[PDB]
């Protein structure tokens, strides 16, 4: 009595007859985003499918006129039923409800429909679709990520980031002088103030992103003024979303010697580098159930970043 | 020997002739916003400025044309300048730049200027303007507020929460519909996920949040589903930025149960509610010297909240 769970629910219907298929994002995540399907007296005769990576594939013959259905990225299925043809020997009808207020409903013309099956959508997340198909579809199952407990981008690496120079732009915050009328040293505090926005960005397809609450567990990319140039260091791991900001006052304090007869011009600056670089990562699905999908991916991250407060001091005899 | 720092900076240049004024955000955050600034021979003849809030006065009596400077928000003074009219009796120049990249420089137009006088901008965040005028700018003095640690919004109230009654939208997650044929109670386990997106934000001046990272210490509007009806309690106060957007996927595992004989259809729900309402609360600034600055304000408060996931089951005869 050992227990399995999966991270995928599908439940098939229909007979045994035709070539098994199976059209389904569960190796990449990608989703149904587009489906067709033609009726016939006893039969549901043909499904053709497109998936969110672009696949787009056709089982059974098509005849006639077909029925459409369009999703649009986070629109889930809410509810499902399938029919057979009441012989056990074809599916039969196919309808569905999604959480954008959508219904679709598709059936065999001419005999009557019998056994509804209503399914579990899982998350709604539907990831296509698994039969077998000959002149006709002979069986079919939709096939859903099963409820989900996280969904989490790890594992990340910037496969370029030691190649990369960036272009560290710089921003004035403040200038100041002082002058030195005596013969002796003198001090002077200098306090500095500055709003920085940080920011990350890292891309993942719109369906997947649009559904699901990603985070991301990944180091991000990190400007340091090094004295021969400019370095993008690959920081130390934490947690973020998938697009973060994170605003504060950047502060220093700056004791500026004056010595005799002279000034001193104290001119305080920071550094803003935007980083635009390809990352490779793991999409890790955790259901509710305990299983897990995991995939590999790769997009865009973009980064804004920001040196210290940098002061530089220029003396003058005066 | 006690120390004693303050949160503003003004440094007045001038003479002691004409009657005092004070035209300054340091009651409410306001910056200076715009400047008109009319020359005489021999001195600044007249200065004309705008705050952040609205206010609009004029020092000294015009005359001649006027040069302008008008601050976009978020645009801080980098450096400042003054001159006297070298006699020691009037304001004889002034002298500025930007972090934007702009600078102005209004002076006296036949006496030549002596000994310039360049200032600490603090923050660069201008607060108005001080000094004396009668015909003529006997003396002024730019304020700014000093180097700033951290900036909060805090002591947040909706003084109109108790009065409200909200608009709860009820969204479909998933519905699934199961069969006993026994004579004999059924049981089934029904997981669901749900992403929502929670968001608040408190409205601001556009010239202090363009310059300053705000925090905000306050409780947030919250929703929840009474057997009465539909509840808005204050949460407890915790740490926001001013805009706050919290993505997650909300979670419920559900235990069905099917009575002998009977259909059971479950429907799965959340509640999404949008506030809009004022509120009010107390900025308080603490600079890197220590000294505070507070101040009341008010604003706009717009959220959207969300209720746990409902289940509701129905159940019929077959
Ligand atoms: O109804 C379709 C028609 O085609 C045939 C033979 O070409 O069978 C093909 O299609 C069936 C439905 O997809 C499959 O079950 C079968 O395996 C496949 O050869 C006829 O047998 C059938 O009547
Ligand atoms: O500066 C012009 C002229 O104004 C007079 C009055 O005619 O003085 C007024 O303006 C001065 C500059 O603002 C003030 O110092 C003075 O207090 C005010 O009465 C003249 O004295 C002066 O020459
Ligand atoms: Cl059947
Ligand atoms: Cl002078």
Same mark, same amino acid.
């Given at each position: ?15 045994? =007859?035709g ?5 389904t994002?569960?190796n990449?995540?990608?989703?149904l985003?587009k489906? *067709?399907? *033609? ?11 497109w998936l969110?990576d672009?696949?787009?594939? !056709?089982? =059974?013959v ?7 259905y369009v999703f649009?990225?986070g $629109?889930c299925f ?15 009808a196919?309808k569905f409800?999604?959480?954008?207020? =959508?219904?679709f ?13 209503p ?7 539907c990831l296509?679709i698994?039969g077998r ?6 069986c079919m ?15 990340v690496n910037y496969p ?16 100041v002088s002082?002058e ?6 003198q001090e002077?505090?200098? $306090? !500095?103030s ?7 960005? *890292?891309?993942?397809?719109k369906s #997947?992103?649009?559904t #699901? ?12 003024e090094?004295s021969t140039?400019f370095?993008?260091?690959?920081g130390?791991?934490?947690?973020h979303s ?6 504060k006052?950047?502060?220093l304090?700056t004791?500026? $010697?004056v010595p005799?007869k ?5 001119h305080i600056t920071i550094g803003?580098?935007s980083?635009?670089?390809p990352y490779t ?8 159930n ?5 995939y590999?991916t ?5 980064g804004?970043?920001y ?7 220029? $003396?003058?005899?005066?």
């Amino acid at each position: 009595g050992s227990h399995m769970t999966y991270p995928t629910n599908l439940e098939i219907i229909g007979g045994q =007859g035709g070539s098994s298929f199976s059209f389904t994002g569960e190796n990449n995540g990608a989703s149904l985003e587009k489906i *067709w399907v *033609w009726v016939g007296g006893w039969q549901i005769k043909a499904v053709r499918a497109w998936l969110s990576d672009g696949r787009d594939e !056709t089982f =059974g013959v098509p005849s006639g006129s077909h029925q459409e259905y369009v999703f649009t990225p986070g $629109e889930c299925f809410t509810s499902l039923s399938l029919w057979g043809n009441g012989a056990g020997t074809r599916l039969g009808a196919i309808k569905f409800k999604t959480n954008k207020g =959508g219904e679709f409903f598709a059936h065999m013309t001419s005999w009557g429909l019998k056994t509804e099956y209503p399914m579990d959508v899982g998350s709604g997340y539907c990831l296509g679709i698994v039969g077998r198909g000959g002149s006709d579809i002979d069986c079919m199952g939709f096939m859903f990520l099963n409820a989900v407990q996280s969904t989490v981008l790890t594992n990340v690496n910037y496969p370029t980031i030691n190649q990369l120079i960036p272009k560290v732009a710089t921003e004035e915050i403040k200038s100041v002088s002082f002058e030195n009328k005596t013969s002796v040293k003198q001090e002077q505090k200098v $306090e !500095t103030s500055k709003k920085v926005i940080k920011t990350s960005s *890292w891309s993942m397809t719109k369906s #997947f992103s649009s559904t #699901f609450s990603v985070e991301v567990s990944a180091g991000i990319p990190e400007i340091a003024e090094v004295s021969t140039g400019f370095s993008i260091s690959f920081g130390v791991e934490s947690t973020h979303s998938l697009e973060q900001t994170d605003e504060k006052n950047e502060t220093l304090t700056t004791t500026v $010697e004056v010595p005799p007869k002279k000034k001193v011009d104290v001119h305080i600056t920071i550094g803003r580098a935007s980083f635009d670089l390809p990352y490779t990562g793991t999409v890790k699905i955790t259901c509710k159930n305990g299983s897990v999908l995991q995939y590999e991916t790769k997009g865009q991250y973009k980064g804004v970043a920001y040196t210290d407060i940098k002061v530089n001091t220029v $003396e003058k005899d005066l």
